[PDB]
């Protein structure tokens, strides 16, 4: 695998850079 896809893949259900947005999806989805 070599943690590679791409495809928005986090711990959450987005890309790495979106991972910052997986709480912070202004919504009660998380907050910080
Ligand atoms: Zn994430």
Do not use: D, W
């Not at 695998?1 to 999806?25: D, G, N, R, V, Y």
């Amino acid at each position: 695998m070599a943690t590679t896809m791409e495809q928005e893949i986090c711990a959450h259900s987005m890309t790495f850079e979106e991972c910052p947005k997986c709480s912070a999806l202004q919504y009660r989805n998380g907050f910080y």
